[PDB]
Design a protein around this ligand. Structure first.
Ligand SMILES: CC(=O)N[C@@H]1[C@@H](O)[C@H](O[C@@H]2O[C@H](CO)[C@@H](O)[C@H](O)[C@H]2NC(C)=O)[C@@H](CO)O[C@H]1O
Length: 860
């Protein structure tokens, strides 16, 4: 990590007890806002008179202010060195309207008591440095604070001293300490401080290049723009130029940006509202934070979004309220300026004001640790990914929607900026910006009649061109995958295990809710597909003979007949054979040569015809890496798997053209990045009906830290971590159409014994893992857990349930899929244009609720 990122964080949130925590891997420094001065000395904000007594809400809030948890905050924040080692946490002193800088600084005497107490503060909370935010010396923000002309010098002296105290301490500790200032943007500020004396005492000067204009001005303008587009409009550029002219070296200047807007009301309804006269601001809230703009203002509630292309700043206007803000784009242009002009880094006030998802802080990081002159591509995610055929030929009016993940659409895109591949001919389509979204394309797909019958999903491909976007040197987007579904809708597929005698089980299979069954499994033996009772590895997994017998007399013939009655009873039901699965030997050998591939194909085709199947699922676990030596693997598996699949599909096309029927070919495929490496995902998919992605087994007893085994989304408390969302995005990134992906639900759990009672059990360091529960099924969970000690919590940013019991071996943490999570996996599949939903496995919920909740969302 090269240039710096400073993220001020407010003292007046509970960060320990916040739901989103802090992704401290996206900034370098973290200034804590603020400590204050009291009787000439640095202190916690909860000990500040003037801030504990704000009359805006003096009831429930003043209490919270006097008992403000800074101790907890500081401990939680420096604790984030866990996730980032490099991180620095400084204490920032002052802020807007913070009093007593002029008295504490005034005389050599009082400076001591302040600079001393400032170290006491730094030491006490184990902090990497001090930041003085005096606003402002000499002129006191024109009467907001106490001030006198002698500040000019005293500021200098105070700063010199602090540097002495912080180098003194360094020579014993071996840790260099940092000293910063936030510094005013105006010519007036530079005139009130001794810059060519001050610079050398400091590591960085935080230019506050915001609040450059606001409701105090008679006309609108940008408050935190990059460039000056008119003579009178201040900017990062004007301010940086002002500071270089006074000798301050580029290498120490941090450019500032803002996660909030400056607002004007009663603006003349002329032009765009930019540079228009403005009346009374007596009604005005003054600012609106970035999260609130996202939620209700940007392209919402009659507020049009605009861009000043010379200033490189966004603004909104509705005919009378104007709002000037920092967005994804303006941050891009500011990062670029830092790099263009060799500045120290990007500073921002402040972190809490970012969106739920941290859109700005993440944008800055991404832009600042891009390598220059090596263009970034436009990013896409999906919000609405499916339109569904009414009949075999009638397509209704529908609308796909794609938010940008990287880059920022012009407020009005032209057709040349988006190209749509794979709308079937006959059917007119339009592109545009999606209403009620800040930054998203809309392909409006008009009703129509398609030329021929639509039996299979159609992959629609959307390309977001560089000309669409506002940023500078950017390349076209990877062609994004959305889906026109056939009239029958998503598939819902159960893995049905062959080691249950379903003929005699009181618990039966629900062929009315499933579209698809995968009988698990067939196997490989001497390069032949055979029943599971022939595979010696399996039969002889355990020595004990009363198992081994059950294994040899596995009720395959029965179950195949049983499945035949399901098929007769429900004639659209498709039942397929899964060759392989965990510990299944034979695949690598079988894929080697054009002779060995031919053998297995023919033998698989013949197994399929003999016991009544509608297609094949291949379940190779796993190629090239062989699940880390469970399975003979080879580098050459990669291109072989792909010839195996190409072959199977050709044999199955032969079969189908002989039996007057369509045979399916499918694989199961893992989530791990090594799988995605080890397989030619871009190449194999054209041969498949879909991929049953195993969006589960993310974390187990093989780690000693708790985490979500099957989360539909990546929790906020574990950035980076596995989710269905992350994994299926990763799949599509490789080129796999959405309409050939299937999301996996798991009907069993995992867990860890010896989890400390912290945060309901969640993301904790684990203990000794002997007597770990292994994999209890939901059945097990119903009898022996749910009410029997344990308590069910829910992480809403992940949408994944979890159990903790303090009084059981540590206690224990359980991670699983349930009704609510399976619902969301199913919503995700409809929203994203996925082929369908899948699970493992039918025998693990005899109650039928997990299936019910997939079915109730996916189909009704
Ligand atoms: C580094 C920096 O920008 N410092 C100043 C900030 O304090 C100021 O933010 C304001 O801080 C006050 C505490 O001093 C808060 O009461 C107030 O709510 C907060 N304002 C906002 C919009 O979050 C910022 C922004 O005006 O500018 C500096 O002056």
């Amino acid at each position: 990590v090269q240039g710096k990122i400073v993220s001020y964080i407010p003292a007046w949130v509970d960060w320990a007890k916040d739901e989103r925590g802090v992704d401290a891997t996206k900034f370098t420094h973290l200034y804590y806002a603020f400590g204050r001065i009291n009787n000439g000395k640095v202190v916690t904000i909860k000990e500040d008179a003037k801030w504990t007594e704000d009359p805006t809400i003096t009831e429930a809030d003043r209490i919270k202010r006097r008992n403000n948890p800074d101790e907890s905050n500081l401990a939680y924040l420096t604790g984030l060195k866990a996730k980032n080692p490099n991180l620095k946490v400084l204490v920032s002193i002052g802020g807007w309207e913070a009093e007593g800088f002029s008295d504490a600084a005034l005389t050599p005497e009082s400076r001591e008591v302040f600079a001393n107490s400032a170290l006491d503060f730094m030491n006490k909370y184990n902090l990497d440095g001090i930041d003085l935010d005096w606003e402002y010396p000499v002129y006191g923000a024109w009467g907001v604070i106490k001030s006198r002309p002698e500040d000019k010098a005293n500021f200098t002296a105070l700063l010199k001293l602090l540097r002495e105290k912080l180098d003194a301490q360094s020579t014993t500790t071996n840790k260099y300490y940092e000293l910063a200032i936030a510094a005013g943007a105006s010519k007036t500020y530079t005139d009130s401080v001794e810059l060519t004396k001050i610079t050398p005492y400091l590591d960085y000067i935080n230019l506050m290049t915001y609040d450059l204009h606001g409701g105090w001005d008679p006309a609108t303008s940008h408050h935190t723009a990059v460039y000056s587009a008119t003579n009178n409009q201040l900017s990062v550029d004007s301010t940086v130029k002002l500071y270089l002219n006074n000798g301050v070296p580029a290498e120490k200047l941090m450019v500032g940006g803002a996660f909030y807007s400056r607002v004007w009301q009663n603006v003349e309804n002329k032009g765009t509202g930019l540079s228009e006269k403005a009346g009374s601001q007596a009604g005005s809230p003054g600012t609106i934070v970035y999260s609130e703009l996202v939620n209700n203002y940007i392209n919402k509630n009659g507020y049009t979004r605009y861009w000043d292309d010379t200033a490189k700043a966004p603004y909104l206007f509705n005919g009378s309220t104007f709002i000037s803000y920092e967005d994804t784009a303006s941050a891009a242009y500011k990062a670029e300026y830092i790099k263009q002009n060799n500045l120290a880094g990007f500073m921002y006030w402040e972190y809490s004001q970012d969106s739920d998802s941290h859109e700005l802080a993440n944008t800055i990081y991404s832009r600042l640790y891009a390598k220059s002159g090596t263009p970034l591509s436009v990013g896409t995610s999906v919000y609405a990914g499916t339109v569904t055929m009414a009949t075999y030929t009638q397509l209704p009016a529908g609308t796909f929607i794609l938010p940008l993940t990287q880059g920022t659409l012009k407020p009005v895109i032209s057709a040349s900026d988006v190209t749509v591949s794979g709308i079937p001919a006959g059917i007119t389509y339009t592109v545009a910006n999606a209403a009620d979204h800040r930054n998203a394309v809309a392909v409006y797909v008009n009703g129509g009649t398609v030329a021929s019958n639509v039996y299979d999903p159609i992959d629609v491909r959307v390309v977001v061109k560089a000309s669409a976007v506002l940023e500078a040197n950017m390349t076209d987007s990877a062609p994004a995958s959305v889906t026109i579904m056939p009239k029958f809708g998503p598939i819902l597929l159960g893995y049905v295990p062959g080691w249950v005698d379903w003929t005699n089980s009181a618990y039966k299979v629900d062929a009315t809710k499933l579209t698809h069954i995968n009988y698990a499994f067939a196997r490989i033996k001497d390069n032949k597909v055979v029943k599971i009772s022939e595979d010696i590895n399996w039969v002889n997994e355990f020595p004990s003979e009363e198992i081994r017998e059950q294994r040899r007399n596995n009720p395959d013939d029965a179950n195949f007949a049983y499945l035949k009655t399901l098929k007769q009873q429900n004639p659209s039901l498709k039942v397929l054979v899964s060759i392989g699965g965990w510990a299944a030997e034979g695949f690598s050998d079988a894929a080697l040569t054009p002779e060995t591939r031919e053998e297995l194909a023919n033998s698989a085709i013949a197994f399929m015809h003999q016991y009544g199947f509608d297609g094949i699922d291949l379940d190779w676990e796993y190629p090239v890496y062989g699940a880390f030596g469970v399975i003979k693997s080879r580098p050459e598996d990669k291109q072989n798997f792909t010839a195996l699949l190409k072959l199977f599909r050709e044999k199955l096309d032969v079969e189908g053209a002989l039996h007057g029927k369509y045979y399916e070919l499918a694989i199961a495929s893992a989530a791990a990045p090594i799988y995605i490496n080890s397989v030619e995902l871009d190449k194999i998919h054209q041969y498949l009906d879909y991929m049953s992605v195993m969006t589960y087994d993310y974390h187990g007893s093989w780690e000693s830290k708790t985490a979500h085994q099957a989360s539909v989304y990546t929790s906020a408390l574990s950035p980076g971590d596995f989710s269905a969302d992350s994994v299926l995005t990763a799949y599509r990134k490789q080129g796999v159409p959405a309409s050939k992906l299937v999301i996996g639900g798991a009907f069993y759990a995992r867990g860890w014994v010896n989890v400390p009672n912290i945060n309901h059990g969640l993301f904790q360091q684990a203990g000794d893992q002997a007597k770990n529960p292994g994999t209890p099924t939901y059945n097990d969970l119903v009898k022996d857990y749910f009410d029997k000690g344990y308590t069910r919590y829910w992480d809403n940013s992940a949408k994944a349930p979890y159990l903790y019991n303090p009084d059981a071996n540590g206690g224990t943490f359980i991670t699983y899929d349930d009704e609510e999570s399976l619902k969301y996996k199913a919503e995700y599949a409809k929203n994203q244009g996925l082929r369908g939903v899948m699970f493992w496995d039918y025998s693990q919920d005899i109650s039928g609720k997990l299936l019910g909740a997939i079915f109730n969302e996916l189909k009704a």
